């Protein structure tokens, strides 16, 4: 309750999974919220479902289109202020090696999760510096920012980028005084209605060798270290990164 | 407000800054509280500082003291019910390199930052698994388990211990469905009355080199990061170093 | 001598610096190699400057060529047999923090440092893997791939990405038995005749509080480490860091 | 060849395994090597394996003995001049859970494994210091100094503290311009003698969810790596961890 009183968020990727969780959460502790997607059909049924318009709304954006991003900004200022909060959540995955990547592939997972987060990142730091907002941008940077896939090459790539990256951000921003902070989390494998859809999946994911606790996460596991690093309680975290993986990396 | 009802908290060091935020924080969330320390007149009035009896209690031990451990878990349940939560935070530290630090100084260091880790997580998993309590062990371990300093030589080993020992205990824990999961938390250079009492300590560490922010932490940064930690909220999250720098170690 | 018997080895920007010291010690060492740089003046002069044809050849290319690097393998093929080793070294910064970076200067530079890079391991892996030529890809990544800089915001994304994405090939050349090692260098500050152009950079990267030798490196450094991991003598190693940094990292 | 001409090298843990391998490289490479063990029937005879008096000499010591310390340094000046280099092998494993092990296991692990390493790298700061020998300590940190074992929970607690503790003494004796760098090198699973005495070992070892090239290493891969830091090629390294496993940290 009232962790995030006064703060105005944008959650790209909000409209599923993991974004939703941190869109629900976000709402229940004062935030109010922007979520984007790609789909105007599942955006506008995802905000009803955690609050009305005074409280979330949807808006429309592929996080690899640099200019929806100034839209994006500017039409969530309108309904609900100066942004504070910004969590690049939105990512795609590719199931390739490195080996079998093709260049199409390569260029559309970096458009979404490196440009986009680049794209992000760079507006936020520009439009909630120096306000007096407390202001935290998070990063989704996945366990695959620490270790190896054999089978997500670019996906690596783009997670290892998108953890530095955020550090070079979180560096400039502190040492500026801009008072925004920069993080980035590190989910392992969280279940949701996409994996649920994939036979086996869970499963494989479950296995001691792979997530030591023998389960996967759940959306909500990410939405809590979210609201942590949003609120001010995180006031002196910055560039750091926070994992939530049931013990993945630690073996 | 209410992040960790039921929860019952052994925190060593806690009658002091770090400790003693994290022990306010615990009790204002619905924790009961156990605080350790080796003074009595320091500590009862700590306990009192912050609660009445049926919230918070002093235990005097050295986290070095084996048997004491023994009595400190004995003394918890008595006052309050099973131990779900152990923040394993007294440490000490020598400033002197490795190259100058004598066989005494190293063992004294070692015995409370490093044996006592180990006796209170060992014992901890003992007492505290198979009940259904979302247990959870907090190891205290430092940016100088991540980074070396030259002149805290014996400290940086018992830190980098603290931080891979926690990974080994928090991997057993999972895999053996025992309900306790374990992680560090890496404070930066924080604030406290006794960093206060060494002239220029501040402001060497808030130098742009040290900590990029330009300022110390303070006591509550570290505190709020337990309590997530402690609580239900992160329960995925084992085998993980959470660190709250003000950006020392990103650089 | 004769550590590198055999061998046939790509190296990306061998014309200067480090590049060109990895390449006098490859031959040194008994590769034969094919030096790679965007200017046929001073590649021509380079490959001179260390040896015979029969020794050591340029091929003008842009690591960003995608076309090019097809070209480039089957020149170093026709020239000395098989590539066994590639060292991708080419690689530009901008001195510009993610915030101050245009979308043009973030494309140009992720086209040579990331797309680049890419491209070799992918093409290497192709062409390397199940000839008993004990491959070994050699990706340069920098501290700037461990700790970030607040002017170097595109930089840092692209090491951060090189670093995680050669774990993925590593693994996955691993698990085939391709017979192809991947790993990343992560030099610190290094003097070359570049560094001697810009007043005042070698002693800003001296001061102990960037570089604690209080010097900053030279070429050779990191040539002794690329022999060591083209080698057959680091048939071991896979998908690992090789950090030669004067203690930058270690604080 | 030649790699190490002029040097003096102390190993402990010398007489077996990778210590062995270690000491044979080195003394193929021009070094003069005090290898110690505990048994002097072993010892004796592992020297005589590698070279004759005037290249490789036995000391008896067990690493956790100080005083043994400063007689092993003033036995290998005797015999082969002043020392220049350190390799801090000795060490052992006990095959327990944090939860389960006993506070003499504990101790026992630790006195070799980490007082050892220290005792060694402290007196080796002193005694090589400001003599122009290019000196170097090698410090043998593991695999399990970077991620947990459930069964290696002493052990892990070791690791980890000599990977930090070798950060702290690198940076000062590069502030210090005290003419000694101190690495740590981190093998995976190794085939030795010993391994192949416990039945299953290396199978388990070699399953692609612990090692992903699918087999274990030699005594040689940790021997080669150890040449590389002990000779001056590697004189800008320090504070770094050296990684040798198969790809077991890149999962
Ligand atoms: N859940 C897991 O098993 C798991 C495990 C490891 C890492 N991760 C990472 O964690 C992040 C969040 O996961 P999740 O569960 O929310 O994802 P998800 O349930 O798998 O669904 C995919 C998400 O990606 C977003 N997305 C993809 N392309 C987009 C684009 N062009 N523009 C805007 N949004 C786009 C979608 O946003 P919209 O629905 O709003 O259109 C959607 O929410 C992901 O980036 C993923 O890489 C997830
Ligand atoms: N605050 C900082 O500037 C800073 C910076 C980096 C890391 N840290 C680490 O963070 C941890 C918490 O810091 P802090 O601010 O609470 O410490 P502090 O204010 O500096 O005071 C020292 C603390 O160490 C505890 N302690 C030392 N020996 C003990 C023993 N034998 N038995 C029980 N407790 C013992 C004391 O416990 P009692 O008071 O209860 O007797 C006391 O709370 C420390 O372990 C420290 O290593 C602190
Ligand atoms: N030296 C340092 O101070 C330092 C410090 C940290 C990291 N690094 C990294 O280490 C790597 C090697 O450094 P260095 O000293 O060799 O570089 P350098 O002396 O600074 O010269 C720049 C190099 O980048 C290469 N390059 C840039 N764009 C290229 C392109 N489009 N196609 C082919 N080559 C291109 C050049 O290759 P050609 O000359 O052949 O055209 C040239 O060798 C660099 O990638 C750099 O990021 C260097
Ligand atoms: N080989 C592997 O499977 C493996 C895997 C991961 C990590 N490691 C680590 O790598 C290091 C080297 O392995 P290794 O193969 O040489 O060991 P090993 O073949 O397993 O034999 C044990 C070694 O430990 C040394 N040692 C134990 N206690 C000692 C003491 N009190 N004083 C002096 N030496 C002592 C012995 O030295 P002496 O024989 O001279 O008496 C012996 O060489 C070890 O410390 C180990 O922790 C090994
Ligand atoms: C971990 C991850 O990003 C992923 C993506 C698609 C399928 C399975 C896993
Ligand atoms: C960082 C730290 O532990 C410390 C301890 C004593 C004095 C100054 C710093
Ligand atoms: C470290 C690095 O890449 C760099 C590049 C250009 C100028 C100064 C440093
Ligand atoms: C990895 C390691 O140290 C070990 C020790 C004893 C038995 C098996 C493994
Ligand atoms: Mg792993
Ligand atoms: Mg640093």
Redesign the interface.
Known sequence: ?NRLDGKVAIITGGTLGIGLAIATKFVEEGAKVMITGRHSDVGEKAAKSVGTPDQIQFFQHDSSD?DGWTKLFDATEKAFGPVSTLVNNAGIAVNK???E?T?AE?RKL?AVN??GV?FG??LG??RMKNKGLGASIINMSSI???????????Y??????????????????????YDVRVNTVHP?YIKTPLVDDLPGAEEAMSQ??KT???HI??PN?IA??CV?LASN???????????????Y???
């Open positions: 309750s640099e090696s490195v080996e990547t260049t390569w970096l490196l440009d680049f990142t760079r730091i520009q695959e920012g620490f270790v190896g896939d054999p089978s997500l090459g670019a690596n790539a783009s997670k290892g980028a998108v953890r530095i990256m955020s550090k070079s951000a979180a560096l400039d921003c502190a040492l500026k005084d392992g001691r060798t030591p606790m023998g996460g759940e596991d809590y270290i942590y309680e995180s006031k002196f975290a910055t560039g750091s990164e926070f994992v939530v993986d049931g013990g990396t630690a073996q």
